């Protein structure tokens, strides 16, 4: 009985590519929500072993699930409502990423890439640094198969084009310190990264590896928990493990510092993404609380929605 941090069964929460849905991995299965307006869309509460990581690929009606036991990847067919592919590993799976034609499995010190077939065939293995958080982004766009992940050298990001594997990877010396957070924009053209120091968020071009914007979260260290771009990557939001969410101008900004910030009253970690409307940010906490805040560059953030999403 390892339980859950909040005693509510929630082991994992994450957004899909455009943040219109989020999924929770629970001790008894998984749950999927429409993000905004908040709506429960699927609840599986009778999956033995639970689910500790959930990846969504609704465009193909699939999810990828990591069993609570951490050694099985299960491809869930969301029309059939069942697992149709299982891959077992001899080490703990930290994350899984999907696109239409690839299953990407993130282990502690390597990333394995498979075909998305009834019998997955391993195509590539990329060594990483130790990667306990399972950092890895995979663009699902038809015309952008970017895979990016922490390189073996501390602070570096490796960028691979799964569509053109013979071209050499791009090696970004993103930070001096251990990487803690990596995020991809919706177009797959920009990645944002933070080290465990968490004072500076850096945005890089995914073709050249060049640094395009550095943002300052603060002068003191923080544990960065989530980063996400808005729809056109004109803004990013950044959350800490204390539940503070900063909103930055990402492109030729007035300031390197955030122009708006809010903090969820639990003081606990949240994931964050922009809502359906461009002046709103969604924050979701493992304690089961959902928040939608409005923002204005010259005003305080105000709370538009509060909900306990595990009560639908």
UniProtKB/Swiss-Prot annotation:
Ranges of the WD repeats in the UniProt entry: 5-35, 41-78, 84-116, 121-162, 167-206, 211-250, 255-287
Keyword Phosphoprotein attached: no
UniProt keywords, alphabetically: Autophagy, Disease variant, Epilepsy, Lipid-binding, Lysosome, Repeat, WD repeat
Keyword GTP-binding: no
Distribution of this protein across tissues and organs: Ubiquitously expressed. Highly expressed in heart, skeletal muscle and pancreas. Up-regulated in a variety of tumor tissues including ovarian and uterine cancers.
One Gene Ontology CC term in the entry: cytosol
Top-rank taxon: Eukaryota
Result, substituting residue 246 to A: Abolished binding to phosphoinositides
Chief localization: other
GO BP field: autophagosome assembly; autophagy of mitochondrion; cellular response to starvation; glycophagy; nucleophagy; pexophagy; protein localization to phagophore assembly site
Record note on domains: The L/FRRG motif is required for recruitment to PtdIns3P.
Quaternary structure and partners: Interacts with the TSC1-TSC2 complex; stimulated upon starvation. Interacts with RB1CC1. Interacts with ATG2A.
Similarity section: Belongs to the WD repeat PROPPIN family.
Protein name, as recorded: WD repeat domain phosphoinositide-interacting protein 3
Annotated organism of origin: Homo sapiens
């Amino acid at each position: 009985g390892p339980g859950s941090p909040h005693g509510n069964g929630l082991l994992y929460a994450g957004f899909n590519q455009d943040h219109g849905c989020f999924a929770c991995g629970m001790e008894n299965g998984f749950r999927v929500y429409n993000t905004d307006p908040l709506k429960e869309k699927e609840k599986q509460e009778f999956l033995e072993g639970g689910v500790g990581h959930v990846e969504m690929l609704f465009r193909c009606n699939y999810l990828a699930l990591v069993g609570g036991g951490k050694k099985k990847v299960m491809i869930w067919d969301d029309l059939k409502k069942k697992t149709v592919i299982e891959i077992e590993f001899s080490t703990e799976v930290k994350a899984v990423k999907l696109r239409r034609d690839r299953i990407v499995v993130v282990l502690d010190s390597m990333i394995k890439v498979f075909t998305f077939t009834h019998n997955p065939h391993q195509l590539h293995v990329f060594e990483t640094c130790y990667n306990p958080k399972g950092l890895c982004v995979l663009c699902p766009n038809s015309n952008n198969s970017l895979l990016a992940f922490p390189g073996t050298h501390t602070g570096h990001v490796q960028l691979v084009d799964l569509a053109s594997t013979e071209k050499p990877p791009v090696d970004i010396p993103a930070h001096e310190g251990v990487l803690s957070c990596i995020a991809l924009n919706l177009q797959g053209t920009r990645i944002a990264t933070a080290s465990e120091k968490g004072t500076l968020i850096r945005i890089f071009d995914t073709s050249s590896g060049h640094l395009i914007q550095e943002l300052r979260r603060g002068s003191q260290a923080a544990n960065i928990y989530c980063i996400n771009f808005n729809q056109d990557a004109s803004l990013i939001c950044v959350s800490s493990d204390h539940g503070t969410v900063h909103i930055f101008a990402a492109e030729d900004p007035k300031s390197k510092w955030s122009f708006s910030k809010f903090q969820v009253p639990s003081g606990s970690p949240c994931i964050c993404a922009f809502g359906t409307e461009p002046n709103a940010v969604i924050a979701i906490c493992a304690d089961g609380s959902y928040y939608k805040f409005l923002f204005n560059p010259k005003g305080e953030c105000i709370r538009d929605v509060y909900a306990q999403f595990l009560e639908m």
